């Protein structure tokens, strides 16, 4: 019923400029693969996650 308050951290994101899509035949056969690496933990920086 009443309003609530809480601290909250940022959530932000970035993209490669890698565009694809199912066209009417020139879809470039719809097949790409991801890969990521992380070299950190930092489970609790200040407060939340």
């Amino acid at each position: 019923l009443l309003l609530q308050t809480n601290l909250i951290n940022y959530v932000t994101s970035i993209r490669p400029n890698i565009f694809v899509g199912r066209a009417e035949g020139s879809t470039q056969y719809g097949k790409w693969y991801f890969e990521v690496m992380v070299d950190e933990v930092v489970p609790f920086l200040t407060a939340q996650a």
């Binding site: 694809v20 899509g21 199912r22 879809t27 056969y29 719809g30 097949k31 790409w32 693969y33 991801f34 890969e35 990521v36 690496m37 992380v38 070299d39 950190e40 933990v41 489970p43």
Partner: protein, 48 residues
Amino acid sequence: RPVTSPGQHLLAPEDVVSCCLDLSVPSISFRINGCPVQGVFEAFNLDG
């Protein structure tokens, strides 16, 4: 929506994660270090 898999944890340091997509049939499947995860997505619009 948790998924059962071996080696369950958050994104630990020194790990590999990836994915694969098919535009023919909507099928988004993921995988991690060692083995793939037991969960995919399907049946979504792809008009963009």
